[PDB]
Write an enzyme that holds these catalytic residues in place. Sequence first.
Site, PDB file in Angstrom:
ATOM      1  N   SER A   1      37.618  19.356  38.629  1.00 20.20           N
ATOM      2  CA  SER A   1      35.676  20.046  38.296  1.00 20.20           C
ATOM      3  C   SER A   1      34.788  19.072  38.547  1.00 20.20           C
ATOM      4  CB  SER A   1      35.566  20.807  37.593  1.00 20.20           C
ATOM      5  OG  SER A   1      36.689  22.204  37.528  1.00 20.20           O
TER       6      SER A   1
ATOM      7  N   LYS B   1      30.196  15.929  33.247  1.00 16.25           N
ATOM      8  CA  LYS B   1      30.773  16.844  33.159  1.00 16.25           C
ATOM      9  C   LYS B   1      32.399  16.253  33.863  1.00 16.25           C
ATOM     10  CE  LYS B   1      31.618  20.435  35.938  1.00 16.25           C
ATOM     11  NZ  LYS B   1      32.723  20.731  34.727  1.00 16.25           N
ATOM     12  N   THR B   2      33.049  17.296  33.107  1.00 15.21           N
ATOM     13  CA  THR B   2      34.457  18.005  32.762  1.00 15.21           C
ATOM     14  C   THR B   2      35.131  17.988  34.261  1.00 15.21           C
ATOM     15  OG1 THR B   2      34.987  19.428  31.880  1.00 15.21           O
ATOM     16  CG2 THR B   2      34.335  18.196  30.692  1.00 15.21           C
ATOM     17  N   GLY B   3      36.730  17.630  33.557  1.00 16.89           N
ATOM     18  CA  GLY B   3      37.114  17.899  34.657  1.00 16.89           C
ATOM     19  C   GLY B   3      39.067  18.056  34.485  1.00 16.89           C
TER      20      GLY B   3
END
Lengths: 236, 241
Positions: free
Chosen positions: B49, B181-183
Site C-alpha cells: 500500500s 503511509k503503511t504497507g
Amino acid sequence: SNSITENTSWNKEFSAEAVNGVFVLCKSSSKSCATNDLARASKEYLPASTFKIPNAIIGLETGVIKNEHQVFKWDGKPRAMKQWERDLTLRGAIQVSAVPVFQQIAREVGEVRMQKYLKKFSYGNLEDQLRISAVNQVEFLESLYLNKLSASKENQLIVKEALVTEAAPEYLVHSKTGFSGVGTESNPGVAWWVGWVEKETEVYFFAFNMDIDNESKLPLRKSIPTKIMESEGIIG
Amino acid sequence: SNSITENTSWNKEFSAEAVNGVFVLCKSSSKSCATNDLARASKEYLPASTFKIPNAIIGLETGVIKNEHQVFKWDGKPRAMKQWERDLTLRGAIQVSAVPVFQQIAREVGEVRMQKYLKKFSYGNQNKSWLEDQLRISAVNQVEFLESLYLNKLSASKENQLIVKEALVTEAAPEYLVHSKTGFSGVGTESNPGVAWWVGWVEKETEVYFFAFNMDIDNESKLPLRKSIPTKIMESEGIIG
C-alpha cells in the site's frame, strides 16, 4: 440555502465554566449552522492572531512569503516570547502566533494591498484596526476550504496544511487560536478558536470566542468547543 | 551522489523484538541517510500500500482524480473489508488502504501512462493490475521519492503534490507534522515471510526528517512493530514524542 439555528443545549458547557461566549458549528453538506447565541455569533470582535490566516494567504499571493518552505530566520535580538526567538516555518510562525514575523509580512505587503485582499475576502470590516464576527469567520474558512478566496489554489492549500493541529484515522482538524489580551474588568479581552474538521466526507466549520479578563481562562477557548464537538461525535 | 551510513546503535531496537528489518532516517535531505543495515536499506521489496502515494499523484496528474475534494462513492456492492463500504475522500481512501478505489484509479490511468510516470518519478526497479505486487522498491528509494514529493520536484503540478502531502498527514503536534503511509503484503510463510512498511517524513520546526522502515513478517501479531520500532528510534532521536 444558508441557515443558522440557536441551540440552548450547549449553554451547559458555557455555564459550567462561567464563560460568556459563543460557539458556531456549520455542517458543509446541509449548509446549516448551529450556535448557542445568535446575537453574539453576529457581533464583531478584534480577530487577534486569527488574522494570521488571511495575512498568511496575502503574504503568499503577493510573493512576500516566497513559498511553502519559506523560513522566517531570527536575527538573534530578543522577542516578547522565547518561543518566537528562533527560525520558524509558516506552520511554526502560525502555531506560536509569532507577532514580529506577521508584522514584517504585513509591512512588506503594505496598507493598500492588505486592505484590497481583506475586502475581496469579505474579512470583517492592521490586526488591531479590524473587527470580525464568528459567523464571518466560518464563512471565510469555508471559502478557504473550497479554494474560493481571491488567491491561487496552491497558496490556499499551503495555508490549509499549515493550519493542521490534530490528525486521527477518521479526521483532520485545521485551527487557529486568537487572544487580544485581558482588556479591563469593564471591557474584557476576547479569546478565539476557529477552524474546521474534515471527518470522512463531511466538513464542519467552527468559530468560538469568549470574554476573557484573566490569562488563566485561556485553556477554555479549546476545552468548551472540544467538549461540544465531542458530544456532536465530530472529534475525540 | 547520496550516501548511506550504518548505525549499529538501533540494532538494539530490532534484536529485542527479534525483527529482521531496516530503518533509514535522513535529516534535511536524502543525500546523507543513517540506517541499521546498509545491505537491506538498498534491497528492493514489493511496495504493498506504500504504492498508493504515487498512485494518488498519477491519478491527480491524469485528471482521473478530478481535484482535492474528489469523493470515491461506494456502489453498494460488498467489499473485502467493511471500512471500505462507504464513500471515501482521498485521505480516507489512503488511511484504510482502500484497494478497490486505487485499483479503479490505476485502470483509468492505464498501465501505459502508469509505467511512464513511475519511470519519470524514479519509483522502484525499472526492469497490469498487480503494480503493488510486481513493483520492487528499496527503503532508500522510498526516502528519495518522499524528498522529491516534499520539495515539489516530482514531474507533477505543485498543487497535485500538495493535495497528496495533506492526505498523508497522520500526526500533528505544536512542534511537528508527520506524513506517513503503511504497507503490508501479508504474512507469507516462515520460508518466504511477507513485508511490512512505514514510510514518511516529519516537518519538525524548520528541519525535515525522511524515514522508511520495512521488516519481514510471518505472523499478524507483529504488525504493530512496523510503527512502534521506527517511532521508538525517532522518539530517542528527539524527532517526535
